[PDB]
Design a protein around this nucleic acid. Sequence first.
DNA 1: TCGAGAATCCCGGTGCCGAGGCCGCTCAATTGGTCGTAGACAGCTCTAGCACCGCTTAAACGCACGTACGCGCTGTCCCCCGCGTTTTAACCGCCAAGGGGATTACTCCCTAGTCTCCAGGCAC
Length: 94
Amino acid sequence: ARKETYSSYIYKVLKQTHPDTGISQKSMSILNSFVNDIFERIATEASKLAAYNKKSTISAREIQTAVRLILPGELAKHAVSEGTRAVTKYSSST
DNA sequence: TCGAGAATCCCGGTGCCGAGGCCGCTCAATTGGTCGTAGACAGCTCTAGCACCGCTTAAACGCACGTACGCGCTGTCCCCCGCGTTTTAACCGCCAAGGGGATTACTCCCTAGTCTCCAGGCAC
């Protein structure tokens, strides 16, 4: 039995950015609630936008428009930068 | 003063464009035998709240200086406001080009299902 969390990945990216910093468990649960909340926000907005575009699939175009909707524009263009980086580094399926 | 004739108040007739009804219809609503799958109950434990109080213990209740300022009055002072006047572009009608919205669908391409092998992940 387990509960799905992202404390290991948060600690990994935090030590990757700055290894000389720590984080307690209460703030870890707060950030886990935060990432589940924004995942719920983006997923429901993408489902709304897919149902509005007469298309019952989820591509990356709806996610791009959804992160252009709810995120601010500097974070929106940084998010499309990170997303294009993720697709271009994932497409090399060798 | 009578009477005929013109003006007006009130009653009756008529456009008129939006609400209401209708024929044709055509891709969905109904029912169905089946079929993998949610799910409701139950032993059984285990685990989190509740009460009593052992033992302390800061903190609220409430009353007393005192002065800062909320409410009201008085004077100030000026800035939108009613109004007049001049300007001006909005609305409407109309002429005109054309450009994306809508609808059809096919190969292709990406996914549901399938089994198979392996590396993540909170617990010891």
